[PDB]
Design a protein around this nucleic acid. Structure first.
Length: 195
RNA sequence: GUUGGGCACUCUAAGGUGACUGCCGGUGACAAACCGGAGGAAGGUGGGGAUGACGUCAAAUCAUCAUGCCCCUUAUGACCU
């Protein structure tokens, strides 16, 4: 009974992913380790963490929910919490652009006005190359860390203007705050100056 | 800097230019906003500074005001070492 829904979920996730990549999001697909332990905490193995179709599908659904909530509250113009990723440091990024030129990769843009899509075009060009891992690593080191902020400053890595965390309030206090602000402003209608 | 000297550059004292997110767009209600993008000595409150109608609250404080209610009065007074 669920198989038809799962096939529609896969198609929708692909449509959302295609849109996200066309918007110029940076797909940072790095090989992470997963340490496997037993019930006694003894190490059994160290494997590559793979992101499957099912994880990527849920990722796209949580992303579009997160974007939709952030955009809604941005236009409501009430105090809210955002998940921001600021523009890269122009000096670090200039050094990265000089670095990838040594491998013969030429990027369209200047370090002070780079579009995320221009970085994604490098990742796509280095995919399945020996130099992939290192170009990827030096690109990451040129980016800023994402953080929580009351200002909607956008999310460079996701190439979006509106982003918040809404989808995990059991394990993230920002999401729990987002839920309280939703209840305060939308459900209870409490948009008064003192609130 | 002496020794002149209008003393340019000082300097000092005004006066006056001066900056306005104004220009100018990316987004978007061709909106806002924000990203800006230039000019410029300097930027978005050019930056720090700056503002009453009914003033008003056992605010705060009986050393605010109270003497409160004190009191000692050749002494709950001053002078000396």
């Amino acid at each position: 009974p669920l198989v038809p829904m799962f096939k529609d979920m896969e198609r929708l996730a692909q449509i959302l992913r295609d849109k996200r990549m066309d918007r110029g999001a940076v797909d940072f697909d790095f090989k992470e380790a997963k340490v496997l332990v037993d019930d006694e905490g003894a190490v059994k193995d160290v494997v590559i963490r793979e992101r499957s179709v099912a994880e990527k599908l849920i990722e796209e659904f949580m992303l579009v929910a997160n974007e939709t909530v952030a955009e809604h509250f941005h236009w409501m113009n009430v105090p809210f919490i955002y998940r921001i990723h600021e523009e890269p440091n122009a000096e670090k990024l200039q050094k990265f652009l000089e670095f990838v030129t040594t491998f013969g990769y030429v990027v369209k843009g200047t370090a002070g006005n780079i579009h995320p899509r221009a970085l994604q075009s490098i990742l796509d060009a280095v995919r399945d190359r020996p130099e992939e891992t290192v170009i990827s690593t030096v690109m990451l080191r040129s980016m800023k860390q994402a953080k929580y902020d009351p200002q909607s400053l956008g999310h460079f890595g996701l190439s979006t203007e509106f982003y918040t965390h809404f989808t995990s309030p059991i394990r993230r206090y920002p999401d729990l705050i987002v839920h309280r602000l939703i209840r305060t402003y939308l459900i209870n209608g409490k948009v008064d100056e003192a609130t």
